[PDB]
Design a binder for this molecule. Structure first.
Ligand SMILES: [Ca+2]
Ligand SMILES: [Ca+2]
Length: 757
DNA sequence: GCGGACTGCTTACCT
DNA sequence: ACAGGTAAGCAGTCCGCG
C-alpha cells in the first residue's frame, strides 16, 4: 500500500522517496533515476540547438536543459510533434520555463507546473492505497489557556489528549487525579512526552479536527518558544506547513495527517461545524462543549480541572471515532484519483477531476492543455444557459409521480460524444448538433472525456456485480465507496467543463450539455401533456412532478410506467427516464420550494425555510409543523393554531435562546464585503477583538430587543445573557416565524396579520 | 418628506 | 468556485403621493 511520495536533494540531484506500507511494516523506497521535464512546441526543429543554449540563474547556479528528445503526442485528438525538455533538478523548471516560452522559435510550452512527486506517481503508473494493508491511527487534540485579544501561541498548551482503538489518555502539567490523566513536570515535558508516545506508538495516520489551522500550528509556536525539535516525522523531520489557497495544510512525512474538518465540510451540510455538532450528526449521541473562559478559570483557580480534562479526552476519542468512520471512503477516493489521501482529502472537486484527467492523459499519450493565465482566464468570464426550471402550478395536488432522467449530463456527454477534441472537427462523416447553441461534435471516433465516462459507467457495473457475489461485510463497504465515488466523479465532468481554471475547460461542451438537457426535459413535458393525459406540476432540470387530475393512485402510477415504456426507446443511447416515487399529496410553493408526502407518510421537504441554516430553529420548526398539519393531516385550522402557539410564546419571552440562533457563512475577506448585514457586522466586531475570521467561518447570532438596522443589535449566540440582553420578540415574529408560515398558508387565504397573537 | 416599492448584495438552497 | 437557476433577507435608494 503506497501512502505518499516526495523528493529530497542529494548533491544537487533530485531523489524520489516512495512511502510504502507492505507486510505490516513501513518502508521508504528511493528512486534517483527519474528526471523532471516539460514540453515545447517549435515553429521549426532547426531552432532546437538555439533553445538548448537558453540559460537561467536559480539562487546561485546556471540552470541548463540536460537534453531534448522530439516526441509525437496527441493534442485534443490531433497528432502533435513537441520537444520533451529534461532538466537536472525539478526547481530548474520554474527558473527556465518563462525564458524558453519567450524564445521566438517556441510557439508554446506544456506540462510545466506538475509537482515532481506527483509527476512520478502518474508517469510510473503508481496508485496510492492499493492492497488490504491495515494502517494504525492515533487521534490527538489540545486544550489551551486563551485570553481575549491575545496573539497566537502566547498562551501555553494545558493538555495534549490522544486516542486509538485501545485507550484514550490526557497529558497535562497540573495535579489532576482521574485514571486516564498523566501529571508531568512542566508544559515542556508534556510536549516531549507526547512526542515519545507517537515515537512508541509509531502511528501510520495522525487524526486532528482542524489541526491544519489550529492544533499543529499552535504546537510549532510552543516548541520554538520552548526550544523543542518537534520530530513526529518517521524520517525524523518536523511537520511542514503547506499553503493551500486561503488556508494552510500540515504535512507529517511517513505518516498521513488526516484532518477531518475539510472532509466533513465537503461531505455533510450542517448549520455549524463544531466537534459537538459533527459527532451528533454522524453517530447521534451528544457531546457538551467546554469554553475558553471556563478552561482558563478552571486552570487559574485549579478548582475544576477534572471537567476540562474529560472534554480533552472526549475530543480525542470522538476525533478517532470520526477518523475510523471517514478514512476508508477517503482511501478509496485516493485510489480512484491516483493521488495521496492527504492531497485528495483537502482537494476541491475541480482538482480531483484534473488529477484524474492528467493520469488518463499520460496513459493515452494526450498532451495536457495549460492552466489559463490572467488574460485567458478573463476571456472565460462569460456565463452560459443552465437547467430549465418550469414555473410550478402552486397549491395542493393529489396522486403525484416524480419522473427524472438517470445521470442526464453524463448520459448526454457519452451519447452525443461531447468533448473539446471532437468539437467542430474539420471533415467528419456523422455529427450530433446541440439544440439552440449549434455546436457540432464528431461521432467517427470516441472523445477523451466521453470514453473515460464510458469506462467509469462499465467499471461501476463490474463493482456492483462483484458486490453481489461477495460476503465479507468490510470488502462490501470498501467496494460500495468505490462505486458511489465513481458516480460522483462522473457527475463532476459537466461542471468541470464550465470551470474557467480547468485545463480541459470547454464552454461549448458545457453549453451543449445544458442545451440537450433542456431539449430532453421539455420534450418529455410536451409529450406527457399534449399526447398523454398528464398535467406537469413542476420540472427543474432532468426531473418533473406530474399527475392526471381526474384519476386515482392506481391509474397515475400505471399510466406513468406506460409513458416510460413509450418514451425511453425514442430517447437516444444512454438517455433514459425513470420512476423515482409516488406521493399521495404534494405542495408546490415556488421554484426550488415544495414538499410531498409518500404512501408511508414521510414528508420530503425541498428549498423551504425548513432546510436553510440562515433561518432560526423557531421558524424552521414552526414551518415544519404548519406543513405537516396540511400534508399529513387535512387541517388548515390546526396550522393556524400552531402559528398562534408560536407567536404568543415568543412575545411572552418563553421560547429558549437555543431556538433563536441564525447561521450565516463568511465567504470572503471581511474587507472585500461591499454590503454589511447581521452576520458581517457581528464578524467585523469579533475581528476588531482579534478573533480569527477566515472564509468558511459560520457566524451564529441572536437579534436583541431594539429597532432600525438588525446588524446594530446582532450579537454572537455565545454571548447571549437573559441577565442583561433581551431577545427581539417582534423580529422573530414578523421577520422569521410569520414569513415562513405565510408561504404555506398564503395559498388557502391567510395574510400575516390574521396569524399573529 | 414619508413610507412603501424596488433593487444590489448576499446566502444557501436545487439539479 | 465543478455549473447555472432561483427565492428571499437586509439595507440602501427610488418614487409616487394630493
Ligand atoms: Ca422528490
Ligand atoms: Ca434510451
Amino acid at each position: 500500500m503506497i501512502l505518499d511520495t516526495d523528493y529530497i536533494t542529494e548533491n544537487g540531484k533530485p531523489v524520489i522517496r516512495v512511502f510504502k506500507k507492505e507486510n505490516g511494516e513501513f518502508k521508504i523506497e528511493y528512486d534517483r533515476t527519474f528526471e523532471p521535464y516539460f514540453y515545447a512546441l517549435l515553429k521549426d526543429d532547426s531552432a532546437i540547438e538555439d533553445v538548448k543554449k537558453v540559460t537561467a540563474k536559480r539562487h546561485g547556479t546556471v540552470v541548463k536543459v540536460k537534453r531534448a528528445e522530439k516526441v509525437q503526442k496527441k493534442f485534443l485528438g490531433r497528432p502533435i510533434e513537441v520537444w520533451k525538455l529534461y532538466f537536472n533538478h525539478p526547481q530548474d523548471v520554474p527558473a527556465i520555463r518563462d525564458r524558453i516560452r519567450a524564445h521566438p522559435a517556441v510557439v508554446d510550452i506544456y506540462e510545466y507546473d506538475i509537482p515532481f512527486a506527483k509527476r512520478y506517481l502518474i508517469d510510473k503508473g503508481l496508485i496510492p492505497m492499493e492492497g488490504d494493508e491495515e494502517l494504525t491511527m492515533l487521534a490527538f487534540a489540545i486544550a489551551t489557556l486563551y485570553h481575549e485579544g491575545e496573539e497566537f501561541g502566547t498562551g501555553p498548551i494545558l493538555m495534549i489528549s490522544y486516542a486509538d482503538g485501545s485507550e484514550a489518555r490526557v497529558i497535562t502539567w497540573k495535579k489532576i487525579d482521574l485514571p486516564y490523566v498523566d501529571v508531568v513536570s512542566t508544559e515542556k515535558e508534556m510536549i516531549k512526552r507526547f512526542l515519545r508516545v507517537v515515537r512508541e506508538k509509531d502511528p501510520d495516520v495522525l487524526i486532528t479536527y482542524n489541526g491544519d489551522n489550529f492544533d499543529f500550528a499552535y504546537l510549532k509556536k510552543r516548541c520554538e518558544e520552548l526550544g523543542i525539535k518537534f520530530t513526529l516525522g518517521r524520517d525524523g523531520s518536523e511537520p511542514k506547513i503547506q499553503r493551500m489557497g486561503d488556508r494552510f495544510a500540515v504535512e507529517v512525512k511517513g505518516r498521513i495527517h488526516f484532518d477531518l474538518y475539510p472532509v466533513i465540510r465537503r461531505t455533510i451540510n450542517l448549520p455549524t461545524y463544531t466537534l459537538e455538532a459533527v459527532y451528533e450528526a454522524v453517530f447521534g449521541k451528544p457531546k457538551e462543549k467546554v469554553y475558553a473562559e471556563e478552561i482558563a478559570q478552571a486552570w487559574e483557580s485549579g478548582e475544576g480541572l477534572e471537567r476540562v480534562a474529560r472534554y480533552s479526552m472526549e475530543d480525542a476519542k470522538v476525533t478517532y471515532e470520526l477518523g475510523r468512520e471517514f478514512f476508508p471512503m477517503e482511501a478509496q477516493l485516493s485510489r480512484l484519483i491516483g493521488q495521496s489521501l492527504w492531497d485528495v482529502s483537502r482537494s476541491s472537486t475541480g482538482n480531483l477531476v484534473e488529477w484524474f484527467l492528467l493520469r488518463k492523459a499520460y496513459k493515452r499519450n494526450e498532451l495536457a492543455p495549460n492552466k489559463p493565465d490572467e488574460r485567458e482566464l478573463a476571456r472565460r468570464r462569460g456565463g452560459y444557459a443552465g437547467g430549465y426550471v418550469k414555473e410550478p402550478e402552486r397549491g395542493l395536488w393529489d396522486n403525484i409521480v416524480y419522473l427524472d432522467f438517470r445521470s442526464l449530463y453524463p448520459s448526454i456527454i457519452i451519447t452525443h460524444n461531447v468533448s473539446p477534441d471532437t468539437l467542430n472537427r474539420e471533415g467528419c462523416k456523422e455529427y450530433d448538433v446541440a439544440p439552440e447553441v449549434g455546436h457540432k461534435f464528431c461521432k467517427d471516433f470516441p472523445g477523451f472525456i466521453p470514453s473515460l465516462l464510458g469506462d467509469l459507467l462499465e467499471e461501476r457495473q463490474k463493482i456492483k456485480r462483484k458486490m453481489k457475489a461477495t460476503v465479507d461485510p468490510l470488502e462490501k463497504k470498501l467496494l460500495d465507496y468505490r462505486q458511489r465515488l465513481i458516480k460522483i466523479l462522473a457527475n463532476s465532468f459537466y461542471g468541470y467543463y464550465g470551470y474557467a481554471k480547468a485545463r480541459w475547460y470547454c464552454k461549448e461542451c458545457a453549453e451543449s450539455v445544458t442545451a440537450w438537457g433542456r431539449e430532453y426535459i421539455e420534450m418529455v413535458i410536451r409529450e406527457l401533456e399534449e399526447k398523454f393525459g398528464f398535467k406537469v406540476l413542476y420540472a427543474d432540470t432532468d426531473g418533473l412532478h406530474a399527475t392526471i387530475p381526474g384519476a386515482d393512485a392506481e391509474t397515475v402510477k400505471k399510466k406513468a410506467k406506460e409513458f416510460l415504456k413509450y418514451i425511453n426507446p425514442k430517447l437516444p443511447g444512454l438517455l433514459e427516464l425513470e420512476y423515482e416515487g409516488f406521493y399521495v399529496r404534494g405542495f408546490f410553493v415556488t421554484k426550488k420550494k415544495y414538499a410531498v408526502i409518500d404512501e408511508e407518510g414521510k414528508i420530503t421537504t425541498r428549498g423551504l425555510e425548513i432546510v436553510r441554516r440562515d433561518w432560526s430553529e423557531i421558524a424552521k420548526e414552526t414551518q415544519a409543523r404548519v406543513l405537516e398539519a396540511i400534508l399529513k393531516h387535512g387541517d388548515v385550522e390546526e396550522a393556524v393554531r400552531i402559528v398562534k402557539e408560536v407567536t404568543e410564546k415568543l412575545s411572552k419571552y418563553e421560547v429558549p435562546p437555543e431556538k433563536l440562533v441564525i447561521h450565516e457563512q463568511i465567504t470572503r475577506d471581511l474587507r472585500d464585503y461591499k454590503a454589511t448585514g447581521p452576520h458581517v457586522a457581528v464578524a467585523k466586531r469579533l475581528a476588531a477583538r482579534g478573533v480569527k475570521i477566515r472564509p468558511g467561518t459560520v457566524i451564529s447570532y441572536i437579534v436583541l430587543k431594539g429597532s432600525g438596522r438588525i446588524g446594530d443589535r446582532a450579537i454572537p449566540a455565545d454571548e447571549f445573557d437573559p441577565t442583561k440582553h433581551r431577545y427581539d420578540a417582534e423580529y422573530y415574529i414578523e421577520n422569521q416565524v410569520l414569513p415562513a408560515v405565510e408561504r404555506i398558508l398564503k395559498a388557502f387565504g391567510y395574510r400575516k396579520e390574521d396569524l399573529r397573537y
